Write a protein that binds this ligand. Structure first.
Ligand SMILES: C[C@H](C[C@@H](C[C@H](C[C@@H](C[C@@H](CCN1CCCC1=O)N1CCCC1=O)N1CCCC1=O)N1CCCC1=O)N1CCCC1=O)N1CCCC1=O
Ligand SMILES: COc1cc(CCNC(=O)c2nc(C(C)(C)NC(=O)OCc3ccccc3)[nH]c(=O)c2O)ccc1O
Ligand SMILES: [Mn+2]
Ligand SMILES: [Mn+2]
Length: 178
């Protein structure tokens, strides 16, 4: 293994690592080689999970972290029972409160740039978007941030802590270049 893989293993909890490996292998990437993508997958998974935790008990359905076939199955059930249009790309969550899918992004650039990229990619219009960065900023569709301030603040703090740990291991720089 590499230093990035050992860091990933000591940084994220093991269930997150396992789901990241699964998701990456399902697309033919090897966690032990494409280690930057491994860290990014772990970070994105943890953010999705903290986010779904931020709501009320029954509020969100978690799409991310399932195998692709089961993810689309759950998306189909949500669409067929709520009547919301089927997105073109797998979202990360479904909000039963606001009645909408959510795409979550975690970026090492400007939340503006990544938001524009994702919103050009989606084009299905009704899928809410919520971007976080590793510097503490966030941006969301209709400036509607879904959760209260405190849950988003916890996510932002975690992102900055991951950033610092990577820097202490001199892995932040190459990570920030992908
Ligand atoms: C005990 C607790 C663990 C965390 C786990 C949770 C993430 C998420 C995990 C799985 C489990 C469902 N599976 C397993 C395989 C098949 C399948 O469908 N997936 C993936 C797809 C959807 C889903 O549900 N969920 C959500 C509900 C319960 C659960 O497990 N969350 C949420 C916060 C951050 C985090 O990691 N939980 C559980 C709820 C409270 C909590 O924090 N611990 C131990 C100490 C640290 C810690 O967080
Ligand atoms: C193509 O490879 C991958 C593809 C997938 C499934 C489709 N893609 C995502 O579900 C997704 N992935 C990311 C990260 C940061 C992991 N990479 C990226 O797409 O950017 N961020 C997101 O917001 C997001 O929705 C899963 C894992 C991968 O490794
Ligand atoms: Mn996703
Ligand atoms: Mn996402």
């Amino acid at each position: 293994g590499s230093h990035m893989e050992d860091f990933v293993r000591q940084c994220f909890n093991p269930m997150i690592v396992e789901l990241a490996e699964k998701a990456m292998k399902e697309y033919g990437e090897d966690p032990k080689i494409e280690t930057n993508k491994f860290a990014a997958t772990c970070t994105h998974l943890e953010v999705c999970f903290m986010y779904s935790d931020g709501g009320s008990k029954h509020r969100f359905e978690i799409i991310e972290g399932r195998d692709r076939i089961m993810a689309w199955t759950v998306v189909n059930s949500i669409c067929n029972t709520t009547g919301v249009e089927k997105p073109k790309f797998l979202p990360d969550l479904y909000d039963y409160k606001e009645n909408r899918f959510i795409e979550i992004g975690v970026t090492r650039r400007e939340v503006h740039i990544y938001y524009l990229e994702k919103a050009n990619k989606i084009k299905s219009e009704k899928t809410h978007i919520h971007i976080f960065s590793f510097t503490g900023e966030e941006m969301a569709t209709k400036a509607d941030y879904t959760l209260d301030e405190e849950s988003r603040a916890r996510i932002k703090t975690r992102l900055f802590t991951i950033r610092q740990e990577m820097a202490s291991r001199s892995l932040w720089d190459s990570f920030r270049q992908s």
